[PDB]
Design a protein around this nucleic acid. Structure first.
Lengths: 99, 86, 97, 126, 95, 97, 87
DNA sequence: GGGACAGCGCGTACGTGCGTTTAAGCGGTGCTAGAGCTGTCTACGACCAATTGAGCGGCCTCGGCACCGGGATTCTCCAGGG
DNA sequence: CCTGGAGAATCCCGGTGCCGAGGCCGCTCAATTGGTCGTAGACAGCTCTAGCACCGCTTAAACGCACGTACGCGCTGTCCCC
């Protein structure tokens, strides 16, 4: 075999990178356009400071990572290694973020 | 030759972006349906924050949104961000 | 007297083409295509506007019927852009003078 | 309307007040010639002229784009046909409308290619 | 090689050749314009019948329009009206 | 030297698509147009524009039909187009009405 | 009310024998499994397009209930005309 | 025309579930039953367009000729032969 | 190796310039009326509660109606000269 790292094991290498580093894992410019787009629905004629966009990203990173960490415990309870939108929908309900 | 009004606004969060956040949670692999769901849960989360953020901005009678308004929105929502302070 | 007036939109189409692209020319034969295209679309929108008034017991035509006719003819992007252009035209008229 | 002033001949054309290109007086001139309705309000001629201008401008811009691909500075009816048959929204309109001295887009099917039921080829667009 | 040798024709028009003037190569180019790879031998006679039916329907309205105008010339304005009603509206002949 | 069947067809496909021409010979079409209208009305005169307009609509209708019949052939397993395809296409398109 | 916002939920469960009866009405005798899904899709696409004219006509009249007359106006615009439900 | 050439068009014997009636029990969506106002089209009065023709002068288009890119042969390599 | 399409030097298409023509787009007043802005009086449709037997909808299931599989030619495709 051409020394292909196992699909299960490639996560472990990716684990040690993100568990050791502090960074932002969402593209900035696509997020910049998305944040500017959702504003038009509620309030048009608006500008956006760079600090405001970064702060919105920082909340998003912690929101999803906390969702991912809690959803993993949902998967470990369901006897499956994989997380599923079944668990994510439950995670939003129990955390109170669904409504 | 040219495509229409816009693209990648909400689809700009591709599979690696979700996977990198998934690798942050410790998981190994995902089902394929998460990618549409993660974009959806991101959209509702931003909408809740951005609704509060523009509300402060409108009260300030300015057309620019600052991090202070975002912090105020996040602090009240239970998602307080201690960064980007004075 | 060869004074008979032919309502041709070639000059107006040419002026619009010049504004968007000063360096792009137009063939004489291709002018008739746009002129007939304008007349056909004009009849389509006017015909829809007339039918709307008859169905709604209305003896007048205003911007509302044209906006309704545009939505009944043009698809999504084309209708919303035409409506936006049409909405801006009537609003500016009330204040231009 | 008590408008006796310096100018009493022609202040501005009805289309020129807003800044439009297609005149609106001509549209209103013979609008009632066709028996569409009676007592036409002022909104309809302005709305109809504007939407016609938007449609006319879009076709011309796309025709110029197709003209540049063909190394021509003049809008040949082939350029107009390419614009019409390149957008699904524009495809529905003029579905069976014939364009004089125009043309049809260079479409081909896979089985016409030498390899039966296959159109892999090499780098050729579409 | 010399002379006609067979199949030669020096009889032009004279109540003939009106619809048979659309020879096999003429039909081929129309087929190639739409895009074909091979056409059967029966498509040539069928094409002439198909074209005639479409022309007959359009010209039937056109002559009716001309007679109402009390004129003998048939203009591009009369034929385009027939196409417009049928749905095959033709641009470029509006003047 | 010798072109095997199907080789020149592909080249001719890519040529006629980008061209602007009339594929029906001019002189036989004028005789055909006059004859069909001769029985409907005896004393008639034909303008040059009307003949050009009739040819373009007739050719484009046949060209559009050929495209549909080409897609009728791909529905079957035969590259060749038979009268089975044309007659079926006419019924679906509503021509036989 | 108004508790339903998104249209993700589908209530378009067309019945299979109804498709068989509709197909057999047109002369069909052997229906495959993949036919059923697209048969609903064709109906959905046709219903979507005809209803676009109905809402536009309804909004122009400032109505809350679509009348049969508005349907005839929408139907006759698209080439498929129904008789007896309007005029 | 004359052989090989690849599936898919019938029909088996057998599982899988959704289909149209039958009692019965809490609701739905139009029609009235009323009024108070918006739309909707009638009269006025000194004028505003935009239409209809006319003299002058300065401007726009097919013609030809230089280019540089597209049509022709003659070798270079991707197509079934050794 | 020719096949049959593609590249750099000669040759064909789009450009610029100048003349008098005689109608077109640009103002220019005349005259009766005519739409938008205010009121008019009359009835129509839109929301919420009532009566009493219908109607749609789900499981109770075991005989027959078709897509998957193997066979068999039988039609069509392509290569070769006048």
């Amino acid at each position: 075999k051409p020394h292909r790292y196992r699909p299960g094991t490639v996560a472990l290498r990716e684990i040690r990178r993100y568990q050791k580093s502090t960074e932002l894992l969402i593209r900035k410019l696509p997020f910049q356009r998305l944040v500017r787009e959702i504003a038009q629905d509620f309030k048009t004629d608006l500008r956006f400071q760079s600090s405001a966009v970064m702060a919105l990203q920082e909340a998003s990173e912690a929101y999803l990572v906390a969702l991912f960490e809690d959803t993993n415990l949902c998967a470990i309870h369901a006897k499956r290694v994989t997380i599923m939108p079944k668990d994510i929908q439950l995670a939003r309900r129990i955390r109170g973020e669904r409504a | 030759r040219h495509r229409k009004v816009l693209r990648d606004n909400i689809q700009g969060i591709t599979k690696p972006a979700i996977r990198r956040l998934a690798r942050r949670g410790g998981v190994k692999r995902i089902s394929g349906l998460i990618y549409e769901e993660t974009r959806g849960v991101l959209k509702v989360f931003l909408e809740n924050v951005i609704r509060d953020a523009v509300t402060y901005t409108e009260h300030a009678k300015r057309k620019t949104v600052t991090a202070m308004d975002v912090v105020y929105a996040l602090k009240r929502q239970g998602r307080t961000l201690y960064g980007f302070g004075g | 007297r060869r004074k008979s007036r032919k309502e041709s939109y070639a000059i107006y189409v040419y002026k619009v083409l010049k504004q968007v692209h000063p360096d792009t020319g137009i063939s004489s034969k291709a002018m008739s295509i746009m002129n007939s295209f304008v007349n056909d679309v004009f009849e389509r929108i006017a015909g829809e506007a007339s039918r709307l008034a008859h169905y709604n017991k209305r003896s007048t035509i205003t911007s509302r019927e044209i906006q309704t006719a545009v939505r009944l003819l043009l698809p999504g992007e084309l209708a919303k852009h035409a409506v936006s252009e049409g909405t801006k035209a009537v609003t500016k008229y009330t204040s231009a003078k | 309307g008590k408008q006796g002033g310096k100018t009493r001949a022609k202040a501005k054309t009805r289309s020129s007040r807003a800044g439009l290109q297609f005149p609106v007086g001509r549209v209103h001139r013979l609008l009632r010639k066709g028996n569409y309705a009676e007592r036409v309000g002022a909104g309809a001629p302005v709305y109809l002229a504007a939407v016609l201008e938007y449609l006319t401008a879009e076709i011309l811009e796309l025709a110029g784009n197709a003209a540049r691909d063909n190394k021509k500075t003049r809008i040949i009816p082939r350029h107009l046909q390419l614009a019409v048959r390149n957008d699904e929204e524009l495809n529905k309109l003029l579905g069976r409308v014939t364009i004089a001295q125009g043309g049809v887009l260079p479409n081909i099917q896979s089985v016409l290619l030498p390899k039966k039921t296959e159109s892999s080829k090499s780098a050729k667009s579409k």
